[PDB]
């Protein structure tokens, strides 16, 4: 069927919560955290059974007063392909997750 953004968006939000929810920023775990987010997000996406090849990215930055900025541009079939991006934030870090669905 189709790439349902709110369906993907809730998957992303729960994956972020499962991985870093309730944790303050630790330098010793940040790379492990980004990997955990994309691992969970992709696994929950593949379980939908839809005919897509997925790209999932997670970006984490410690909060210092400095900002974090992202954007994506694609060259695909907009009638079939889609994307979802969630910007998550707590008292100590930013986390931005982008999931792209490319139909086959």
């Amino acid at each position: 069927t189709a790439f349902v953004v709110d369906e993907v968006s809730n998957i992303v939000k729960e994956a972020i919560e499962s991985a870093i929810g309730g944790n303050a920023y630790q330098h010793s775990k940040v790379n492990q955290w980004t990997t955990n987010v994309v691992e969970q997000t992709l696994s929950q996406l593949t379980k939908l059974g839809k005919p897509f090849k997925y790209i999932v990215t997670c970006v984490i930055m410690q909060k210092n007063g400095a900002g974090l900025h992202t954007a994506s541009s694609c060259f695909w079939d907009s009638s079939t392909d889609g994307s979802c991006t969630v910007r998550w934030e707590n008292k100590t870090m930013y986390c931005i997750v982008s999931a792209f669905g490319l139909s086959i």
Partner: peptide, 24 residues
């Protein structure tokens, strides 16, 4: 089909960390 993602942080920051995972 091509996807390009761009991430920018202000130089005052400590840095940035990123993971990509694909099912393709």
């Amino acid at each position: 089909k091509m996807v390009v993602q761009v991430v920018i942080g202000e130089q005052r920051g400590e840095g940035v960390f990123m993971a990509s995972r694909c099912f393709w």
